[PDB]
Enzyme design. Sequence first.
Site, PDB file in Angstrom:
ATOM      1  N   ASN B 314       0.857  -1.181   0.000  1.00 24.38           N
ATOM      2  CA  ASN B 314       0.000   0.000   0.000  1.00 24.38           C
ATOM      3  C   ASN B 314       0.914   1.260   0.000  1.00 24.38           C
ATOM      4  O   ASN B 314       2.124   1.110   0.063  1.00 24.38           O
ATOM      5  CB  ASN B 314      -0.857  -0.050   1.234  1.00 24.38           C
ATOM      6  N   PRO B 315       0.344   2.473  -0.074  1.00 24.40           N
ATOM      7  CA  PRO B 315       1.105   3.737  -0.106  1.00 24.40           C
ATOM      8  C   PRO B 315       2.279   3.966   0.855  1.00 24.40           C
ATOM      9  O   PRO B 315       3.309   4.459   0.399  1.00 24.40           O
ATOM     10  CB  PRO B 315       0.016   4.809   0.039  1.00 24.40           C
ATOM     11  N   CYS B 316       2.171   3.670   2.133  1.00 18.40           N
ATOM     12  CA  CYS B 316       3.285   3.986   3.026  1.00 18.40           C
ATOM     13  C   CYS B 316       4.259   2.830   3.293  1.00 18.40           C
ATOM     14  O   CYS B 316       5.151   2.951   4.128  1.00 18.40           O
ATOM     15  CB  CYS B 316       2.735   4.576   4.313  1.00 18.40           C
ATOM     16  N   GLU B 318       3.833  -0.161   4.548  1.00 17.76           N
ATOM     17  CA  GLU B 318       3.789  -0.968   5.780  1.00 17.76           C
ATOM     18  C   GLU B 318       3.089  -2.330   5.640  1.00 17.76           C
ATOM     19  O   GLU B 318       3.308  -3.180   6.467  1.00 17.76           O
ATOM     20  CB  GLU B 318       3.243  -0.161   6.959  1.00 17.76           C
ATOM     21  N   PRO B 484       2.412   4.858   9.943  1.00 19.01           N
ATOM     22  CA  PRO B 484       2.773   6.240  10.160  1.00 19.01           C
ATOM     23  C   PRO B 484       1.999   6.925  11.307  1.00 19.01           C
ATOM     24  O   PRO B 484       2.576   7.730  12.086  1.00 19.01           O
ATOM     25  CB  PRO B 484       2.474   6.869   8.807  1.00 19.01           C
TER      26      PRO B 484
HETATM   27  N1  LIG Z   1      -6.571   7.591   0.345  1.00 13.31           N
HETATM   28  C1  LIG Z   1      -5.775   7.902   1.354  1.00 13.31           C
HETATM   29  N2  LIG Z   1      -5.169   6.981   2.123  1.00 13.31           N
HETATM   30  C2  LIG Z   1      -4.354   7.356   3.150  1.00 13.31           C
HETATM   31  C3  LIG Z   1      -4.092   8.702   3.455  1.00 13.31           C
HETATM   32  N3  LIG Z   1      -3.260   8.730   4.528  1.00 13.31           N
HETATM   33  C4  LIG Z   1      -3.016   7.458   4.888  1.00 13.31           C
HETATM   34  N4  LIG Z   1      -3.674   6.637   4.046  1.00 13.31           N
HETATM   35  C5  LIG Z   1      -3.668   5.147   4.068  1.00 13.31           C
HETATM   36  O1  LIG Z   1      -3.592   4.885   5.514  1.00 13.31           O
HETATM   37  C6  LIG Z   1      -2.477   3.978   5.684  1.00 13.31           C
HETATM   38  C7  LIG Z   1      -1.824   4.235   7.067  1.00 13.31           C
HETATM   39  O2  LIG Z   1      -1.566   5.632   7.284  1.00 13.31           O
HETATM   40  P1  LIG Z   1      -1.708   6.324   8.774  1.00 13.31           P
HETATM   41  O3  LIG Z   1      -0.930   7.558   8.569  1.00 13.31           O
HETATM   42  O4  LIG Z   1      -1.240   5.362   9.814  1.00 13.31           O
HETATM   43  O5  LIG Z   1      -3.255   6.700   8.830  1.00 13.31           O
HETATM   44  P2  LIG Z   1      -4.275   7.275   9.932  1.00 13.31           P
HETATM   45  O6  LIG Z   1      -5.006   6.054  10.400  1.00 13.31           O
HETATM   46  O7  LIG Z   1      -5.110   8.266   9.236  1.00 13.31           O
HETATM   47  O8  LIG Z   1      -3.447   7.931  10.994  1.00 13.31           O
HETATM   48  C8  LIG Z   1      -1.484   4.456   4.654  1.00 13.31           C
HETATM   49  O9  LIG Z   1      -0.403   3.550   4.606  1.00 13.31           O
HETATM   50  C9  LIG Z   1      -2.384   4.550   3.424  1.00 13.31           C
HETATM   51  O10 LIG Z   1      -2.550   3.230   2.834  1.00 13.31           O
HETATM   52  C10 LIG Z   1      -4.671   9.680   2.625  1.00 13.31           C
HETATM   53  O11 LIG Z   1      -4.547  10.917   2.802  1.00 13.31           O
HETATM   54  N5  LIG Z   1      -5.500   9.234   1.582  1.00 13.31           N
END
Ligand SMILES: Nc1nc2c(ncn2[C@@H]2O[C@H](COP(=O)(O)OP(=O)(O)O)[C@@H](O)[C@H]2O)c(=O)[nH]1
Lengths: 618, 627
Positions: B314-316, B318, B484
């Site tokens: 996925n994007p980050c 993990e 993250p």
């Molecule tokens: N579509 C979308 N997905 C996001 C975004 N930010 C985080 N994600 C998804 O959420 C996953 C985990 O991010 P995290 O920062 O831990 O998200 P949180 O739960 O919003 O704090 C990322 O690895 C992405 O796959 C965003 O701005 N847009």
Amino acid sequence: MKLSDLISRWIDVEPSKNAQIILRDRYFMKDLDGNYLETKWEDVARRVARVVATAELLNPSYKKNEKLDRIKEWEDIFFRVLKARLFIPNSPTLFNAGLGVKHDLLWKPIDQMTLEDYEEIYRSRNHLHMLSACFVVPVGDSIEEIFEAVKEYALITKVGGGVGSNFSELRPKGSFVAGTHGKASGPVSFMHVFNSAISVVKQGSRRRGALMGILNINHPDIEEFIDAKKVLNFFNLSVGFPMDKKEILKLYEEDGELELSHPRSTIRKKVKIRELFRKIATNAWKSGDPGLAFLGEMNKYYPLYPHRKINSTNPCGEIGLSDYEACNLGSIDVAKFYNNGFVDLEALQELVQIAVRFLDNVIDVNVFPIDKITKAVKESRRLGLGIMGFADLLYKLEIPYNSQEARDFAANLMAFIALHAHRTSYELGKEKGNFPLLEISRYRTEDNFVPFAMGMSNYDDEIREVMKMTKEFRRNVALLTIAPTGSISNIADTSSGLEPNFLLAYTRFPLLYVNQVLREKLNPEILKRIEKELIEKGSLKDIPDVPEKIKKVFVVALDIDPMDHLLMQDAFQRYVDNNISKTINMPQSATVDDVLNVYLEALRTNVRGITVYRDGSL
Amino acid sequence: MKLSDLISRWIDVEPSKNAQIILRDRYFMKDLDGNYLETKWEDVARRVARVVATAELLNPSYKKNEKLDRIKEWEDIFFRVLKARLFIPNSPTLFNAGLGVKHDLLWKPIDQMTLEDYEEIYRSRNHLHMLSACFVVPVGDSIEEIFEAVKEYALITKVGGGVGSNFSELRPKGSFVAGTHGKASGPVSFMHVFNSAISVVKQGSRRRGALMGILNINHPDIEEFIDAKKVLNFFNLSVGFPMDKKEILKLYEEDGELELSHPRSTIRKKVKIRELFRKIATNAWKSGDPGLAFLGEMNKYYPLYPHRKINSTNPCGEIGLSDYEACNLGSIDVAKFYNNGFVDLEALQELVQIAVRFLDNVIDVNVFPIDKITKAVKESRRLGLGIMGFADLLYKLEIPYNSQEARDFAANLMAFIALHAHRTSYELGKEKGNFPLLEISRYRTEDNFVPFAMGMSNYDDEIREVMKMTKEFRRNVALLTIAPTGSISNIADTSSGLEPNFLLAYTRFVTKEDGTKEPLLYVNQVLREKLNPEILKRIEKELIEKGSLKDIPDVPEKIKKVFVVALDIDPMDHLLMQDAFQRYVDNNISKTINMPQSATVDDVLNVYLEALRTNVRGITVYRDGSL
Ligand SMILES: Nc1nc2c(ncn2[C@@H]2O[C@H](COP(=O)(O)OP(=O)(O)O)[C@@H](O)[C@H]2O)c(=O)[nH]1
Ligand SMILES: Cc1cn([C@H]2C[C@H](O)[C@@H](COP(=O)(O)OP(=O)(O)OP(=O)(O)O)O2)c(=O)[nH]c1=O
Ligand SMILES: Cc1cn([C@H]2C[C@H](O)[C@@H](COP(=O)(O)OP(=O)(O)OP(=O)(O)O)O2)c(=O)[nH]c1=O
Ligand SMILES: Nc1nc2c(ncn2[C@@H]2O[C@H](COP(=O)(O)OP(=O)(O)O)[C@@H](O)[C@H]2O)c(=O)[nH]1
Ligand SMILES: [Mg+2]
Ligand SMILES: [Mg+2]
């Protein structure tokens, strides 16, 4: 004269060097390794005729035992008309006929053909065997629907089709999106995504994508749409007018207001129709877009309205199509029917009958990429038979294009064609079966339904009788168009559609075309003089000497004033059941108000849409 | 202490005004008219707790006589841990839980709840009820497959998921296209179309698109790809290494060549792997992209490999996911578990237990936009339980982040969490049934399979035992990540994931009404408590300006050593902390390797080489001041 003897006149006339280059470049079939399987126009005629004749396998009026003789007779007549370039189908028919089929069957001699060979041809057509130039698909107001439609665009583009959509279902920019509590991006922003997709999909080196985008005059984002091309380089754009032309003309004359609204938006607004029109005319004056699409006028003459509806045209406007509908085209070179001061109507009637069958047969051997389209075509069997060579015909008859004489000739010729095409559709309905939807169409449920305005020919009463006959038998929902013929008129070495020649001498991108009728008429000495100046000035108008007579006959697009372009379009449209491709050329010195006046006259005429192009604009 | 005693300590503590801004902005549910249906964090915790407790309707171990009681009990414990902000699920769980459900059910007092009420909640979850943050889809080498994937990206983005793909199936630019006799556009050209799509799709104001694109190191267009982001603004880009990390390091050490090739193309090329690496390092040094994705290393620990295969994250970075797989996440704030010089493992083990049941329950009430995804998730039940607050915890324990002490502590903490998570997956498989693919997984078909490397903890032997027990019962194919926590760490008022604090103090800006921009000053709360307030007032100007304590005069050395921020910590110390966690995490880890503005491209290369020797599964670098 009999058609067979006309065929004899033209069949061994070789395509020009210029047409041969075009054929080699994109029309001669190659194998996977890039080797030519075809080297001459004869080979294409053979291939296409054989494939389209195989449709006769499905004819219920033929006994299994007679089918072979009958199939070969149709192959033979199709082949001879095609080789002579008296009639040519749209490009996709030429490019794709025979795809999938063993190379040993597509060019084999006809006297060796067995019934099994034709069955094998029919069975081996592959998923790419797409022979139609014109498509419309809907774009519904959801992410699912938008992106399914993007996918459809790409699939149609890949196999070589031109596709249009009306984007008016998409809710305007800012609108509430309940699902996300968000704000909608609007149709223009989504059209950018369609464009991006088509930037990466094409029919290889043969055909890039070609798109139409329509947005209706009362949509809240109409102003942004009108300025959208001022990116969207694969789109032509036209403003849609779903209401009666009369209603919109009255609104304009009364300086009224138009309410911009949408069923799934709170966004509402009022604008003066004159202001909107001026904005359209201003952009058109600059860049040539957007055009006007008189969708109300199309539905007025659509035999299945209102239970089906025309919402859009294909890229060049010539066919109005219901959702998922497609249409295959073909054109007669009427310049080849000139005989000693007249059009040979004996031979013409015979070719119209052949042409209608050919186009109807293409439906049966055509393969589309989406099932919904296969279904819509099978139910309606819309055809687009038109003409090319018109301007060159007028040259031969010594008729100036910009004259009432020309327009009365055009109406009468188109009327003759329409009578015989529809009579042929009657005969084919009796022979092969009516189109599935006849029963629910206005041909059945109404009396005195005629799919065009008429009013400019003595054929009108005979046309009315035929339309009454087609209450009982009718193969096709509609049969006629005039297309651009941008490529096929070049293959046929003739003028394009109903357009005047743009130039009498000129080079295209090696070199150089020079009007053969002029070459055959003008004093060969007074010709080599003037020639330099003619390529320089782009017209004979103010070259001296050069008889006035030759000047008045041998007019080119910019010799002919905007209103004379428009009235020519009307004369044809009165006897065309689909629409017409016509560019209203305008001099560099025309103004925005000159454009507006074309629009207002257009609203009074019987035209179904408008395209303008001001010289020097782009 | 008992978890219930820790809950008491936190439950009546409200979020900071900072966190309340974020909540009002995008977490509090509103009706179609915009009116707020929620105005306190409490209201969100109630709704989410109730929706996720509704999955206990499906628990086959309950007699209907107890079912209401059991459900109400889990709703209660879920609510208390969420309200306390001890554990918080990924944002989409909070945004979307309860969509489709009548408003009269989501917040009414729990003592008014009937089993009919829960049954109705379960029935009325609508097509936007998507609770998972992480997705992967394939992009096959055809126009049909490409544009079906473009559509899938739009649908996933609409509901607020982040999606990745490996684009390597796409034939390289200039390859033959038989159906048209044409030449292929190549993956990078297609990725531009995906970006264009996502430029017009978002989850309203809540959440823009977030994409991952991976191309494998031996793809003939790799060089174009490496420079692609030097447009694709919605993509993070990573280079994929489907082969063994060791094989790559060995080719590098020998100065060897890589043959670039594709199964649907005739052209092949040889490139020096060192040259390719320097290209990657140079671009990353400039812009932070592309990363490295050690796909091979992920498959090494994937219990379903080779029956199924991880081709992308996925994007980050993990979660490594198979095709059409998704994963829901959540995180524990470990800063809240500090007690008098030690971590409270009593209370932490109980929360691990609750959290794994919470996350596994999410799967049962989750609605995906595409059937193939629903199927893949049902078959695997992958979860992503992680931590936040780790940096803050170290401060409290008076441990410097850049120290072997910290890394030893990290490994031990993550080893403990891993042990009790996988234990609760055992208990859950026994209570609710195993994940459908247990049979064909390496937890059954091998002896001694463990989904991570270990080697840095006393707990390794017990973890080995738990993994053996799991040959028989196991609810989930994998359980752990560190994300993250870019939003949920804000809501919890805590440090982000396993990252060090980026700064100890900065000016926050409050919208006043009247006008401005009232500047406030945020100082890290643990620092606030340890540092003499007289000193703090004295240095804080300089601390904001210089972004570190290190060169501030008359700050005690002990305070300097403990209260480090990201740029005080060298790249190797960032990297080794990632290794310490990854040794006890079965999915992957989100970690930025921060590099000083003065780092060179050679320093970046050395990070990549050290990474090849450690147990990390991927690399992201960011050089301060580069963008
Ligand atoms: N579509 C979308 N997905 C996001 C975004 N930010 C985080 N994600 C998804 O959420 C996953 C985990 O991010 P995290 O920062 O831990 O998200 P949180 O739960 O919003 O704090 C990322 O690895 C992405 O796959 C965003 O701005 N847009
Ligand atoms: C989701 C979303 C939709 N839209 C536009 C696309 C369509 O034109 C329109 C609706 O798309 P939909 O996909 O229908 O959104 P929805 O059904 O959840 O919301 P509603 O019930 O109100 O329809 O909104 C965007 O512009 N951006 C977006 O992020
Ligand atoms: C048609 C077409 C395909 N492509 C790319 C898309 C895919 O990555 C790849 C295959 O497309 P396909 O849609 O699979 O093309 P095909 O099946 O007709 O031909 P082939 O048997 O050789 O697969 O080519 C383009 O870049 N441009 C195009 O116009
Ligand atoms: N995809 C695609 N379609 C085209 C293109 N040119 C023409 N068409 C389609 O063919 C229709 C008729 O155009 P015409 O110029 O008569 O085509 P010809 O048959 O090639 O001479 C247009 O309205 C489009 O629907 C093109 O370049 N690309
Ligand atoms: Mg919708
Ligand atoms: Mg293919």
